[PDB]
Amino acid sequence: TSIMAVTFKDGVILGADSRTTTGAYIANRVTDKLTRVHDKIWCCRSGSAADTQAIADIVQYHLELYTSQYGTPSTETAASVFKELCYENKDNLTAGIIVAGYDDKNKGEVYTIPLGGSVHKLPYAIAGSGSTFIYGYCDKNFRENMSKEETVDFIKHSLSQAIKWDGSSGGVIRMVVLTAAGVERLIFYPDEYEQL
C-alpha cells in the first residue's frame, strides 16, 4: 500500500491506491482501502488486509453503539478506539491505519496510528510501503488551508509518485472528500495520473 489523508479549508480528504498483494501477485487490482467507520469518519488501511478489516469492523461496531447512546462521536474518539485495539494487541497485529473525520466544531482532523499503537494528530499523514518515496515531495508541497481542488491535486500528484516507485502500489487512485456539504467519492484512472 500507499495511503494518505489531508486536512484543508473546508474539511479533509482521504486517498489510497487499489492494489492488494500476495507476494508479487496482485490478488486484487481494484481494492477499496478507504473504509467507513461512521457517516463522516473514515479510515485508510495499510498492512495486513485481514487484521485491518477485523479492526475496522470492530471500530464500526463500537461507534454504532456509541452513537445509539451518546450521539455523534468525535474524530478523536474514533482514533482512540482504533488505538486501544492496536496498542493492546500489538503482538498479534500488522496494521497501519490513518483515521480522518469532519466535525463542524473541529472541522477536518487527521490521526495516524503506526504499528506500535501510538496516536499522532497531524495536519496531514502518509502511510503504507509507498509512503517512503513521497516524504520529500509531500513536506515540500503541503500548505495549510488549501482549497478542495488544490488538495485533490496534492493527493493525486503524491500518490501518483508513490505508485510509480512502489511495486506494492498501483491500480486506481480512490479518494473520499469529507466536508459540511457531505461525502464525495472520487476515482482517478492510470491514463490520467501516470502522465502527470
Binding site: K90, P114, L115, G116, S118, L122
Partner: protein
C-alpha cells in the same frame, strides 16, 4: 515479549542548588525514518514534578494516561489535593517503578527508560531513574540512552558529587544542559534539533520551555 516501534531518544537531567532541570528532544523515530517531529516527551505532573520518557512511544502514551489518571484518583475525597496531600515526585516515581518491575516480571515490559525530576514538599531535590527491567537508581546527574554515554560526562564536570550541588546555580546548570543537547545533536543519529526543557525550582516553581532549538554550532571546519 515486545519490540519497540516508534521511539524517543535521550532524556537528560541534573540537580542544582534550588532544584532540578530535565530535557528531551521532540522526535518520534520509526527505525531510521525520522517520522514524527511534534512529540512532547516531557510530561508534567502537578506543579512540582516532570516525568521524562524515552523508548517506545505507544508505551509512553500509555504511561501518560496512567499519570493523568493518578492525578484524578488522588483528588478523589481529598480536600488537601492542592496542598499537604498533593502528589509528591517520590510517590509518582515509586508507582511507576512498581509498574515497570511488575511488567518485566510478567515477561511483557513497557519498553521505556524513565527519569522522574521534581522538588519534594520539604524543598529537597528529587531525581531518580527507572527502566523496562525495573532497575532504579539516583545520582546528581541522570541520563538515558546516548545521554548516559555523552551527556553524563559533561554534566558530571559541573556536579561531580553531593557537595557540588549547593555551589551550582540555575544559570550554570541550564547552560550545561543546553550544551549537552547540542552535543547529542552532533553525535546521535536519532536526535532532532528541536527540544523541550523543564526547570523545577523550590522558589520559582515549574518553568516549562517549548520549541527550543540547538544553536551556535561549529561546522565551518571541514
Amino acid at each position: 515479549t515486545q519490540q519497540p516501534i516508534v521511539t524517543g531518544t535521550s532524556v537528560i537531567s541534573m540537580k542544582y542548588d534550588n532544584g532540578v532541570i530535565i530535557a528531551a528532544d521532540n522526535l518520534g523515530s520509526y527505525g531510521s525514518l525520522l517520522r514524527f517531529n511534534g512529540v512532547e516527551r516531557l510530561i508534567p505532573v502537578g506543579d512540582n514534578t516532570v516525568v521524562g520518557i524515552s523508548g517506545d512511544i505507544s508505551d509512553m502514551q500509555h504511561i501518560e494516561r496512567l499519570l493523568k489518571d493518578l492525578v484524578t484518583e488522588n483528588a478523589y475525597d481529598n480536600p488537601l489535593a492542592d496542598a499537604e496531600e498533593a502528589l509528591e515526585p517520590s510517590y509518582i516515581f515509586e508507582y511507576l517503578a512498581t509498574v515497570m518491575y511488575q511488567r518485566r516480571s510478567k515477561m511483557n515490559p513497557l519498553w521505556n527508560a524513565i527519569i522522574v525530576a521534581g522538588v519534594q514538599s520539604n524543598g529537597d531535590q528529587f531525581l531518580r531513574y527507572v527502566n523496562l527491567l525495573g532497575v532504579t537508581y539516583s545520582s546528581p546527574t541522570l541520563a538515558t540512552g546516548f545521554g548516559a554515554h555523552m551527556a553524563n560526562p559533561l554534566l558530571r564536570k559541573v556536579v561531580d558529587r553531593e557537595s557540588d550541588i549547593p555551589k551550582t546555580t540555575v544559570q550554570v546548570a541550564e547552560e550545561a544542559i543546553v550544551n549537552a543537547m547540542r552535543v547529542l545533536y552532533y553525535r546521535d543519529a536519532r536526535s532532532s534539533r528541536n527540544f523541550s526543557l523543564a526547570i523545577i525550582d523550590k522558589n520559582t516553581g515549574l518553568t516549562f520551555k517549548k520549541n527550543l532549538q540547538v544553536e551556535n554550532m561549529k561546522w565551518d571546519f571541514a
